[PDB]
Design a protein around this motif. Structure first.
Motif: not given
Ligand SMILES: CC(C)(COP(=O)(O)OP(=O)(O)OC[C@H]1O[C@@H](n2cnc3c(N)ncnc32)[C@H](O)[C@@H]1OP(=O)(O)O)[C@@H](O)C(=O)NCCC(=O)NCCSSCCO
Ligand SMILES: CC(C)(COP(=O)(O)OP(=O)(O)OC[C@H]1O[C@@H](n2cnc3c(N)ncnc32)[C@H](O)[C@@H]1OP(=O)(O)O)[C@@H](O)C(=O)NCCC(=O)NCCSSCCO
Lengths: 305, 305
Positions: A61-72
């Motif tokens: 879950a914590a890693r899925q957050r990271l790709f979220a930032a790069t996506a945002e």
């Protein structure tokens, strides 16, 4: 008085991180996931693999957050997460394949119910024909005997959220790659890559650079030689016994000849490869499972940093 | 029709990711952060460094989430986050040092107001004495000329949340390490490591394995040679002019001799090092800033995976 990026554990200590994680594996199912020569029981699955499973989902879950930032950031459009890639590495006969199978079953049975695939890298081994052409039959298992270009494509393709991605299939029985066989992987939630070679690093980007978590199953080099020789002797009445086995001629060997043959192949091919290419890769694995002569996992090394 | 872990940008495209990020740098402050020969103006800081700054903070929070999971797992006790380590790499004279200084100022002036330190790796260079002893004076800048053991300790110590961690100090003027000088780093929110060598990978864990984000300032090898020679010629009236300069003898060189000397040192020491050790490291950097002959940044390569 001297920091380290690692944290070392005792089975007693590690055992305690299970918390109240459900044991969703029967003793019957565990046995079907077991490999020849492996001594794994439900207690170890409970005591060792349960905390590991917990830790992994915490990070998924914590890693899925990271790709979220790069996506945002890139300000792009999801509902289909980035697959969480796990690499399992280790010597031949150290048990990595069993470890990988248990880890898959354990992870796939988690409340939210994920899609957990498992691909073995030996399917990216060049065909025996190509090996002979490149003069690598005596080096089967070394980094050069694999089609790293193809392997990289596959993993890149899968982590990019590719709808469909498929890989070749290797037959341990025929000691070669199966003509026209494909392993299809459709947008998994977690992809487990298991191989001798997976943690390798280099000049260019490699499969290891795409992992989100990595396990290195470790044991004493002298203990593995023992497990190897043992397994070899036991395959005279199992795999080698089949007429279609590439090593059917070994089935007839006597305890004596077999031990000789087994030791030759070990110090000649498997040992060099272990020392030269696999072992030098241990420092970088996220989790190192140290096995004891009895196949028991009694020490764990985690990368805190 | 063939996925890649990267995303390539145009200055026009990248320029658009700024969103409404505040430009907190005056044209006067930018000039003091500027390096000899650098052509950076507020427009580029606005157009290129602002989106980069945004992207970085997006990830600083997302990465802090990751260490949270590992902490929640180990079930340990915070209020002092894990320092976010950024590595900046590039050839000699490509401008990485300026890029690093701008990046620090830009990041330190962010609403929440972080503690952003900057350490240059040249401070971990062995003293000239040690170099002579090891016969490396002609190889100053190569991976072997640095005390990688000490460098690793430093970074490990800082990311472990060490209260105080300090590093040696290098004098470009005296071309050696300053006796008794220390750069102290107390629990920073973001530590920027800048050096030729920082992105290096290997058998054992290295500083690069501890980075949370990395920048590679790239340019045409032929353009850097030009910048290098140019700077060399210009240092005759600046740095070399000082009597305490180790290369004071160069100040008297004529435009002609200087160009010869500069080219010799380039193809002999700096170029080999660039080709052999630095360039092979580019594929792994998170962000690659490609500069044009005019020192302008016109292309960007981001690692999406
Ligand atoms: C082909 C290669 C690279 C495969 O490496 P792996 O990482 O898959 O080896 P690993 O020990 O993990 O074996 C994985 C599984 O593959 C099984 N296996 C290995 N070799 C054979 C085989 N020849 N026939 C049937 N099954 C085999 C092994 O028993 C494991 O099954 P389980 O865990 O389900 O019980 C390796 O076995 C090899 O051939 N290396 C160099 C040549 C060599 O060792 N030749 C001796 C052939 S007879 S000895 C037993 C296998 O080495
Ligand atoms: C010592 C070492 C490894 C340092 O590498 P760096 O990564 O720091 O080089 P880089 O080009 O990034 O220089 C960083 C800063 O350090 C400055 N600088 C470099 N060399 C000198 C110098 N000798 N005297 C004063 N300042 C210098 C340079 O102008 C930058 O300042 P600003 O950005 O604030 O304007 C490298 O300069 C070296 O000596 N390499 C091999 C030997 C060599 O090139 N010798 C020629 C000496 S005279 S030429 C200009 C510098 O190469």
């Amino acid at each position: 008085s001297e920091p380290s990026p690692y944290v070392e554990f005792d089975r007693r200590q590690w055992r305690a991180l299970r918390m109240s994680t459900p044991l969703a594996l029967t003793e019957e199912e565990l046995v079907g996931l077991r490999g020849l020569g492996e001594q794994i029981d439900l207690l170890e699955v409970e005591e060792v693999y349960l905390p590991l499973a917990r830790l992994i989902h915490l990070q998924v879950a914590a890693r899925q957050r990271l790709f979220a930032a790069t996506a945002e950031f890139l300000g792009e459009p999801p509902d289909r997460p980035v697959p969480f890639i796990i690499g399992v590495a280790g010597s031949v006969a150290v048990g990595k394949s069993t470890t990988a199978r248990v880890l898959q079953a354990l992870l796939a049975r988690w409340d939210h119910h994920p899609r957990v695939d498992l691909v073995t890298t030996d399917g990216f081994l060049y065909p025996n024909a190509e090996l002979q052409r490149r003069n690598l039959m005596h080096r089967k298992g070394f980094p050069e005997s694999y089609n790293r270009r193809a392997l990289m494509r596959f993993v890149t393709s899968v982590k990019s959220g590719s709808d469909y991605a498929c890989a070749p299939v290797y037959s341990h029985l025929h000691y070669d790659i199966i003509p026209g066989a494909e392993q299809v992987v459709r947008h998994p939630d977690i992809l487990i890559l298991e191989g001798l070679n997976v943690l390798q690093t280099g000049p260019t980007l490699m499969v290891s650079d795409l992992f989100d978590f990595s396990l290195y199953v470790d044991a004493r080099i002298e203990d593995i030689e023992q497990w190897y020789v043992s397994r070899f002797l036991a395959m005279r009445t199992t795999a080698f016994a089949d007429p279609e086995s590439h090593f059917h001629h070994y089935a007839a060997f006597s305890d004596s000849q077999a031990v000789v043959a087994a030791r030759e192949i070990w110090r000649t091919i498997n040992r060099p490869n272990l020392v030269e290419n696999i072992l030098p890769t241990r420092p970088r694995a996220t989790l190192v499972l140290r096995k004891d002569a009895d196949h028991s996992i009694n020490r764990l090394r985690l990368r805190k940093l």
